[model samples]
Target: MNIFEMLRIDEGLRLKIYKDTEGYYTIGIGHLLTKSPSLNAAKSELDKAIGRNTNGVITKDEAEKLFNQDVDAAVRGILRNAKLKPIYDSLDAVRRAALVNLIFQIGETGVAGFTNSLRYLQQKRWDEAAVNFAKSRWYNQTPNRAKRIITVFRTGTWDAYKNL
Candidate 1:
């Protein structure tokens, strides 16, 4: 695993300053607040590892690069999601990738709430899983992205995303 994805497993994904763990104001990839700081600096090698920054806005490509910096780590993080254990191994590669992307977009905890779909997935009922997933609150919240994943659940290809 590289850095950010490994950070996500421990820190959980935070697109914004959601909150802090044991103590302080925080930022992306488990960062803590401070004066202007580099995106990769550990504000503390002495006490702990952390940092801070923000103009409050950034280009989508910038954020995307930060998230995509590590492929292996991302894969590791995906497979490590506790909620996915029941059905992870049962899925084919493309379907597995789609589920992982869904978890990354939502969260392991949130995805667990998509239990009915996961149940269908575990039983190898692909069609039912796709329908149930398309009907999920997640889908209602992000229909376009859901279309990509549902397409994977049904057709086992990421073509929908590519076409976009």
Candidate 2:
């Protein structure tokens, strides 16, 4: 599958506002509306996207729009990150999608902190790359998602995503 479809499965689509695992106010496909400039701005954008004043719901169209926007930004962030760009270019599509999944969740700068992981990935040391990822607090926080990405690193396939 493409990066977008992979992310859609990983992130999960939601049409209503909900508290995330960390209790943050989120909507759509994990969009943190609270992180917007202000509550006013968030509401304005939400209303505009849904084509009406929303209480706690979003349209599938608007949700997809936001997901695409976030995914694009994440990809750009990874490309713009000096340490990640070349490493990103060295991988195949499945591996690249694994990195994008990382960028989608933890962001570019966040992923950039995985020094040994990036180096291992750069050298095509799949198991080492997976190991480094497993050593992080991120893995501890979301073991399932982290393991899925780690398996992709180890196997160079989307095998981990099939059941989802």
Candidate 3:
């Protein structure tokens, strides 16, 4: 499904799309309920920013522009890794989407920073992956959010927060 569909961007989810005076779009997260344009637009901007800022590599700054945080970059970085690509590809679509959301919140590097945890996921060690996933910095940083995402990752089921 599309991002809007996957994210279920509606009132209860507290998601809203807005354009800045600079003409950039952004997505609003929870509680704080921030604002951003569309997900696709943000991804494109992030890709461009990453390309421009990192000399072809995606640095924290570029990711922050897209996600507004370093953890998000860390998660995405892990997913982007060639080594992790196959494993990620093997997941169901819902799980894949949930994982991407987790990555977006955590940052690939942040997830990999959990050296042991990364290894578990890479090894197809589901239980360990779950444990490590919950122990992540993102987990500690955003407990409730991480828990919800983890549930989706584990069960491959959609919750209210699936794509947000």
Candidate 4:
């Protein structure tokens, strides 16, 4: 497996709508449903996502579809960033996955805020990059997941997956 499998574990799977730690209405595999401006708007989005007209539940197939779409969106967003594209293109698959994983959590704009860390990462200064990442509020909010992602970024391997 790869990013998809890793994300399934990191984000966890749920067939029903649930509020995340940050209280956003999320469904499937951390596929955010409440990014919409209102609750009714979010429900409408969820209904469209599952291709149905009722309730708060989604099927595994529907969840997988959403997960794939989210991953693709995140990848595209990262690639679209002028500064991040070259760095992303230079990374190995595993390290690339780590970057995608970070984007999934914080969005491309949020990751862009990590200016210093990205610079270190671009320079191939793994330890320095990790150090900058570890100091962020993102790391503070979810230490376990951030730690594993940081380890992968620093080591350029799937070694961190063992702990999952």
TM-score of each: 0.58, 0.87, 0.50, 0.93
lDDT of each: 0.58, 0.81, 0.51, 0.87
lDDT of 3 by residue, 52-106 (tens): 4222234333333444443344445645787656656777777666666655434
Give the RMSD in angstroms, all C-alphas superposed, for model 2.
Answer: 2.6
Clashes of 2: 0
Of 2 and 4, which scores higher on lDDT?
4
Higher TM-score: candidate 1 or 4?
4
Model 4: what TM-score?
0.93
Q: Considering TM-score, where higher is better, how would the candidates rank from best to worst?
A: 4, 2, 1, 3
Q: Find the 10 residues in a row with the least total lDDT in model 2.
A: 32-41
| Cα-based lDDT at residue 143, candidate 4 | 94
lDDT of model 2 at position 46:
68
Off by over 4 Å in 2: 35-52
Poorly placed runs, candidate 4 (over 4 Å): 36-38
Which window of 10 residues has the lowest lDDT sum in candidate 1? 42-51
- List the pairs of residues colliding in candidate 4: none
Q: After superposition, how far is residue 8 of candidate 1 from its true place, in Å?
A: 18
Model 4 score (lDDT)? 0.87
**95, model 3: CA deviation in Å?**
1.4
Better of 2 and 3 by lDDT: 2
